[PDB]
């Protein structure tokens, strides 16, 4: 599993469950093409977005719908979404774990890249 | 000053100086219209992006060129950039300070919204 | 001002106001000798803790009373406090700004060290 | 497993391996008593510190030796250590995952508490 995302809620100290996200890949003509999508599970994780074969070199964008997450909890948050944009697999295949830590007016994002 | 950005470098323990960024407003056709840009000062701050009259309600994106910053320092970064996307002034004009804390494989962004 | 602390609230998107903290210096017997304290202003900042003459090399601890802050806001926190422990002035006097970003179940602390 | 710690390196985008930490519990007389210790594995995780039976209610402190971690990589970091202090099990037994994200001049810590 070459691309996984984990989302935590910094207010409750819990996984952020049922958070929707879409992944995009930059095409040769510079547009963002839809690549994969999913929502976080009860553990705050989203697995199975792609395969080693499909996940070729390129620039990818993960757009995490954090606004809908907060709104369903009654909160009007600052950010519309949390976006993570990165070049992947430039030196060969790697495994990427993207973590997002959510607060109503702040988010943090971290990448763990393994070989 | 309705919109200010402050950037810190978590590797060196300093303001992040000469960080370039662009501010976009979302157009009617859902494309991003650039409208302001600048680079952070010796204090890591960028002021004077817009004015209260011009800074009307809408969705705004700040794209911070973190990759160029880390490249200029000889340090390999993960992200292409750090984006902050938010709806402004939904309850009337506010002063926004966007605070970004940068590491090569992680960043955080926080909004301090004052009235 | 050799030592300043700035605290932000990631839930409300604001300076964290009236946050109490104590500064300790490590004694010869490895106990913590209190020597300064204060509470953050309307801007979330605490200035005037020490002076350049008094702020000699040594190990210092800032204990930020985050639990009281969250309790005063009616929000359940995880931590008893946020501690920052550091050796000061190891290469000669520096100006230290300690920046703390607070959420109920997460915090970050960053040092901006200028010369 | 009621108490686990995970440590990541924000510079390299990797688990922080072989990071030492000590856990303490506040005694009835207010002193910190040694509770458990260990070092992070190749995955940046430390498991098996305690048991459900042993991990009674109380105030606990995790002192993570982040300075030694950075020094072994050639870096003189800001913090002496990263300390996480918290009341545990106040409403019955819970499972605690403490995460720490390390940069030379910044650290973040998060708690995920599950029932």
From Swiss-Prot, chains A, B, C, D:
Changing residue 45 to G: In AMYLD1; amyloid polyneuropathy. Changing residue 43 to P: In AMYLD1; amyloid polyneuropathy. Glycans are attached at residue 89. Detected in serum and cerebrospinal fluid (at protein level). Highly expressed in choroid plexus epithelial cells. Detected in retina pigment epithelium and liver. One of its GO terms (biological process) is retinoid metabolic process. Changing residue 75 to N: In AMYLD1; vitrous amyloid. Belongs to the transthyretin family. Thyroid hormone-binding protein. Probably transports thyroxine from the bloodstream to the brain. Homotetramer. Dimer of dimers. In the homotetramer, subunits assemble around a central channel that can accommodate two ligand molecules. Interacts with RBP4. This is Transthyretin. It comes from Homo sapiens. The gene is TTR. The chain holds residues 30 to 144 of 147 of the full protein.
